[PDB]
Amino acid sequence: NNASGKLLALDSQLTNDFSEKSSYFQSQVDKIRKEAYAGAAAGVVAGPFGLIISYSIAAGVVEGKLIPELKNKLKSVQNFFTTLSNTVKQANKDIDAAKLKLTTEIVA
Amino acid sequence: YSIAAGVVEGKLIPELKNKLKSVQNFFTTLSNTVKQANKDIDAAKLKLTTEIVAIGEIKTETETTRFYVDYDDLMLSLLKEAAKKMINTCNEYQKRH
Amino acid sequence: VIPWQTFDETIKELSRFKQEYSQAASVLVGDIKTLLMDSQDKYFEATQTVYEWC
Amino acid sequence: VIPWQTFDETIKELSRFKQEYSQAASVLVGDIKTLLMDSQDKYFEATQTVYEWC
């Protein structure tokens, strides 16, 4: 009965902290956007060439490769979260079937 | 003023509202969990107390027949009738299970 | 013009609220679940013993 | 011209008041609720025992 409660207790915390890390991620992405376009902002020390080559870096490096990698890492987080929740749900079934199996035999 | 009215006024403040909304939703959900646990505890307590009462009802007739033993009469109609009472009591309790 | 430091620290406090409350809540919820199962088992034993006597 | 430091520190003290009092209050309220349920249970047992004797 102790670990029976420990399971649910960890499960609820897992479900909460998944969305809390999701919120952290969305707060992080637009921060990185602002930082990227701000690093690309002060590249006006050159002429019009230095402008477009700075926005080329901002739009090809971060906008081209970094953000989908962030999405991919997020996807793996989602998948692992789902898998572990399934493991929890399976262990629930296990415990309850064991308890029923015992009580029936007690009655018999 | 373009920066002040496009960055903060355009994106930051609705993000603050969105974070606030999630806070509200989680607050409501956890309060609902609390309210559910309340129901759980109180239903469990009532379920126990009712069974306690049902047991003590049988215990009453049991002790009654026990002191009806000590007349040293096996042919006492009081004793026979109290036994009939206890039999039907046990039948009605077992039928409930 | 973009107080992003203050913004992030605000978000930190906001998140830290919910962290603390989830942390405090779920433990006690699990304690409740344990006590519920324990009372269930006691109930089963008591009723079983009574029925077997009867 | 905008004493915002002093403003915020005032708000800090004001909030800290209510934090401390909520903290002190709710614990004792829960203690009361516990004692109420305990007295209820004692009452139930005593009355039950009397009735079963009678």
Numbering used by the authors:
A (entry chain C): 142 to 249
B (entry chain B): 196 to 292
C (entry chain B), D (entry chain A): 34 to 87
Please give the exact wording used by the authors of the publication that reports this structure.
With the data from sample #3, we were able to observe not only the tridecamer in addition to the dodecamer but also a new oligomer with 14-fold symmetry. Final 3D reconstruction resulted in EM density maps of the dodecamer, the tridecamer and the tetradecamer at the resolution of 2.8 Å, 3.2 Å and 4.3 Å, respectively. Although the tetradecamer map was resolved at a relatively low resolution, the model was still built based on the dodecamer structure model with identical protomer fold and inspection of the electron microscopy density maps for assignment of bulky residues. Although the N-terminus of αA1 helix from the tetradecamer is even more disordered and not well resolved, we built the model similar to the dodecamer. The inner diameters near the extracellular edge of the pore are 70, 72 and 77 Å for the dodecamer, the tridecamer, and the tetradecamer, respectively. The outer diameter varies from 110 Å to 123 Å as ClyA pore complexes incorporate more protomers. Comparison between Prot_12 and a protomer from the tridecamer (Prot_13) or the tetradecamer (Prot_14) shows that the overall fold of the protomer does not change when forming various oligomers, indicating a rigid body protomer assembly mechanism for the ClyA pore complexes. The pore complex protomers from the tridecamer and the tetradecamer exhibit the same fold as observed with the dodecamer, indicating the rigidity of ClyA protomer when assembled into pore complexes.
E. coli cytolysin A (ClyA), also known as hemolysin (HlyE) or silent hemolysin A (SheA), belongs to the α-PFT class. ClyA is a 34 kDa soluble monomer, containing mainly α-helices with only one β-tongue that transforms into α-helical elements in the pore complexes. Each protomer in the ClyA pore complexes is composed of five α-helices, namely αA1, αB, αC, αF, and αG. Here we report the cryo-EM structures of ClyA pore complexes in the presence of n-Dodecyl-β-D-Maltoside (DDM) as dodecamer, tridecamer, and tetradecamer at the resolution of 2.8 Å, 3.2 Å and 4.3 Å, respectively.
